Design a protein around this nucleic acid. Structure first.
Length: 246
DNA sequence: CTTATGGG
DNA sequence: CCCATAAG
């Protein structure tokens, strides 16, 4: 199977990712920023029990760690429960970066009619593959209690305004060589959503093999369940790609 | 939860 | 102004 041939590349069989070639990210603050500590709105037991197993998994994974920080932002008390951190006051204090992720419309414009064999992959827990420098970790702290202390992220967090752009730029750096090694393939990147396009089913199969091997080696993980491999018809970024249309 | 937005 | 809505 595509599964069995590339155990390392799939989130299902390769374990949590970690982009080993990428330096831990340092997040520069605006020139006048100082830490803000927003109190945690009391959370119901129902919400707390719902959130708890997720927090424990992240701690087990090393993705969350205990800390003491002058920064604090709230977790949503009503967030099936998944914890959602309100990072808006942190976002306001972080220096802006240029938005380099192309809009899907423009991204798709670089897909030639010559290449009508497609593979679509989405990377699982993409942001969590990027390490955060210890100096930047305290920025993202929140409170956690089991009826008290803070935890923070050791990886690029959800809800942080620059995560999509920083991830897209990091993956571009990591996939630069693949592009050079396969000049006859088309590779479109939209943060964690990838489209590989080839001239033939054969080229697409071989290209897809190489891309999975490369992604796996670099520490990224693709969803095997959602993968669309070597089809002439795929769903990518809300479009149906068919017969060179869309 | 809080808050930014804008139709009505 | 009010609010439904969306989003962190």
């Amino acid at each position: 199977t595509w599964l069995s041939d590339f155990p390392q590349a799939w989130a299902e069989t390769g374990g949590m990712g970690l982009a080993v070639r990428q330096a831990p990210l340092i997040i520069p603050l605006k020139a006048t920023s100082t830490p803000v500590s927003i109190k945690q709105y009391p959370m119901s037991q129902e919400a707390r029990l719902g959130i708890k197993p997720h927090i424990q998994r992240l701690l087990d994974q090393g993705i969350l760690v205990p800390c003491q920080s002058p920064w604090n932002t709230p977790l949503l008390p009503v967030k099936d429960y998944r914890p959602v951190q309100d990072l808006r006051e942190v976002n306001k204090r972080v220096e802006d970066i240029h938005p380099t992720v192309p809009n899907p419309y423009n991204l798709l414009s670089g897909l030639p009619p010559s290449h009508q064999w497609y593979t679509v992959l989405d990377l699982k827990d993409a942001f969590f593959c990027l390490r955060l420098h210890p100096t930047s970790q305290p920025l993202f702290a929140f409170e956690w209690r089991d009826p008290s202390g803070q935890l923070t992220w050791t990886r690029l967090p959800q809800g942080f305004k620059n995560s999509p752009t920083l991830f897209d730029e990091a993956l571009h750096r990591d996939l630069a060589d693949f592009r050079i090694q396969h000049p006859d393939l088309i590779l479109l990147q939209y943060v964690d959503d990838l489209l590989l396009a080839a001239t033939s089913e054969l080229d697409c199969q071989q290209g897809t093999r190489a891309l999975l091997q490369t992604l796996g080696n670099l520490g990224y993980r693709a969803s095997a369940k959602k993968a669309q491999i070597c089809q002439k018809q795929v769903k990518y970024l809300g479009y149906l790609l068919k017969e060179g249309q869309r």
